[PDB]
């Protein structure tokens, strides 16, 4: 039954594995460091261990070895909706397993317990200026709840021992998952309609009761619920979910360690893609075409943006998901289809005459159409949604690295005096 | 002769030697990867490249080229006082040049100017509840004034250009740099001297003004400042450098950088040391001792994982402690453990530095001058450190290192190696 002791079988299971290899086949060469890599941002280096999630280059994610198709096919579905309930995925990220319907019954009935956001909270984000940008108001949220961290107690108290840390880890990743979308609806409600709030729905699951919060009718709540599952999880070397893993690594809280991530996150590097290809789609509609659409579609400089990827060598199946998505739900939505006609002529394009690495879209250059399209119109808000969808596989990740005893993170620099030496 | 212009200099000259190792040398092997090291925190791996400072395993921590004896020794000295001051520091570690007095004096008129703490700052750690950690209250003061960042409207103003964006990361770290000792006084006063405060007084340097926040008398002042260069960087390798650096690297500014440090700075295995070194000290004390052991048990403040010898910043602090607090009980039993636990650990094996680390001798400072506050003793360390994180920031963007992204394994692709 109970997912926490399923996840203690699980880890039962995974120890023994990490201690073997420790043990036995420490030294096996795994990959190279060159110059290159060291000056550009330990660029492809395989350098980290999870097993959340696993970045194929060619075939895109997969969680737990299971396709975007897989997992959206086999989780149970919300009773009266499309997509699978965000909590099965949760479970799913964590024990590996796809949960029974009386299995995500049990997280969502933990989630409804836990989802309540503290005063204290909303206080403080009272007393930041309104004015700040959602992201810093988000990432603060979760930083003044660190207060709750029962990870930090524990450890407080001298009751640490590598075997149980995994323990406490769980009960605030469950805790700040619950959480999270109500602090990214109270950060909607409070900077963007008129600082006025719909209450919690307690029947409602996760991404049902997101939608409830933020004000938006069906079926935004599939959206939200396919969206935060899309976003799950890209492994553990994107920024957001490696600076997430690396805060952990001191023994530093999940709520320290996501307020980290979201500081990540928050970069135009990271976070910015789905704003940043939905505001050049509807500038290139108005100026560059009438408001029209139709066939003729770089060269002079700039790129395409939300195709390209440090990691991703095809199509992303993130991406294609979406896809799926407003062909379903918004076939004539002007700013979809534009979007698929980009699908069709860029490619090509950016692959006949090469430069780039992965022609192909990423998830960013179709996830604002579809936002935009249900009203929800606040760019800067965007990532605040990508925070809450990530948190999903970070956390799951967080309590696994702990479950393993994974050590501090801490690679050793060189100067480049040292660099030219060498040579 | 400006601290901008000549850092701009520093720039113009560094540039071409990166272009000319990314084009020419670019696929020249510095280092492996082994499954022991994926697994164990990239632990070795030769991966980050910075020049702020450099951690050396036997001879340790080098700012800039220079030793800490090196460092202390040559850089000008706040009128007065035995140390530093901390402005000048930071100008070393932004240009490579030890300052001159004249140059060190322009810094800290500098940050004088750039002093004070936005009300908002303290409206929001007033909603906070009293009873957070101080380190949290750190870390969401740092967050909260994002708000002023002059980098991230700078990007969001349509003006991001590779050759320029140092300038307002420089702004936000100069900005920055110069309230951080604000915000930890002003956390020190609320939450553990009865919410009564001191104003800044404009004529002091950064250490001095510091202390006169906090409320304590010379030479806590040189205290602070010497505290504060030590603790200033350990190469970009350490979590909370490290933390900054990543979260920089998605062109994320130094406030969002700096708060995700915090965030790593917090953790047990990286900012609890000092305070824990102390507690075991005046346990040791009390019941113990009134005023070896094998089993179980580590001896707080003595490994590292990149040091191999005695750590410069421990005996920096040693230094200090003989000359002002001579016969410090606390400190005696500081300077008797430096005498007994090295033999007694390398020979016997276990531990791969069996040598101090700053930590092993903070507290017994602090502890001296009335910071009695242990969990306010990592605050402290995240003043300091914002010396070289914020100085490698500037340097990341003037040298446009790309976004941090290394890529993962699971254990089925690590098992399948054998």
Redesign the interface.
């Known amino acids: 039954s109970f997912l926490k002791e399923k996840l203690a079988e699980k880890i039962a299971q ?1 120890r023994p ?2 201690t073997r ?2 043990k ?28 959340i999630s ?2 194929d280059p060619e075939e895109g994610i997969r969680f737990r070895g299971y396709t975007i198709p897989e997992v959206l096919e086999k989780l149970p579905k919300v009773p009266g909706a499309e997509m699978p309930y965000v909590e099965g995925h949760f479970y799913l990220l964590l024990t590996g397993d796809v949960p029974t319907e009386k299995e995500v019954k049990e997280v969502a009935e933990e989630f409804k317990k836990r989802r309540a956001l503290p005063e ?1 909270v909303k ?2 984000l ?4 309104r ?3 959602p992201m ?1 108001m988000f ?2 949220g979760i ?2 709840m ?2 709750e961290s029962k990870f ?1 107690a524990y ?1 407080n108290a001298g009751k ?1 021992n590598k075997n149980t840390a995994w323990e406490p880890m769980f009960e605030d990743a469950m805790d700040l998952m619950a959480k999270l979308p109500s602090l990214g609806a109270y950060i909607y409600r409070m900077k963007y309609k008129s600082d006025t709030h719909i209450p919690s729905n307690p029947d409602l699951d996760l991404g049902g009761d997101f939608a409830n919060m933020m004000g938006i009718d069906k079926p935004y709540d599939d959206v939200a619920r396919l969206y935060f599952i899309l976003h799950s999880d890209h ?5 957001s979910a ?2 997430a893993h ?7 809280d999940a709520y ?2 996501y ?3 979201m ?9 910015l893609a789905n704003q940043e290809v939905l505001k050049w789609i509807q500038e290139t509609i108005d100026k560059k075409l009438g408001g029209k659409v139709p066939t003729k579609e770089l060269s002079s400089g700039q790129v395409i943006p939300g195709y390209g990827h ?2 991703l060598r095809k199509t992303d199946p993130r991406y294609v998901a979406q896809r799926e998505f407003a062909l379903k739900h918004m076939p004539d939505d002007p700013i979809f289809q534009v979007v698929s006609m980009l699908y069709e002529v860029v490619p090509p394009i950016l692959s006949s005459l090469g430069k780039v690495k992965d022609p192909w879209p990423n998830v960013d250059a179709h996830s604002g159409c579809i936002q935009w399209h249900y009203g929800v119109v606040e760019y800067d808000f965007y990532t605040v949604l990508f925070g809450i969808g990530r948190a999903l596989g970070v956390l799951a990740n967080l309590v696994w690295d702990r479950a393993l005893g ?15 030496k ?2």
């Open positions: 995974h594995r990490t290899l420790l036995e086949f420490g030294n096996v060469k795994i990959d190279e460091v060159t110059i290159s890599q060291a000056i550009g941002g330990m660029r492809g280096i395989k350098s980290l261990v999870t097993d696993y970045l204290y206080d403080t009272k007393a930041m200026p004015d700040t940008h810093t990432a603060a930083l003044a660190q207060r930090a450890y640490f492994e553990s070397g994107n920024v490696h600076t690396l805060v952990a690594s001191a023994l530093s320290y360690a307020s980290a991530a500081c990540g996150l928050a970069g135009p590097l990271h976070g440090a990691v994974y050590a501090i993170e801490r690679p050793k620099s060189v100067t480049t005096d040292m660099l030219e060498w040579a």
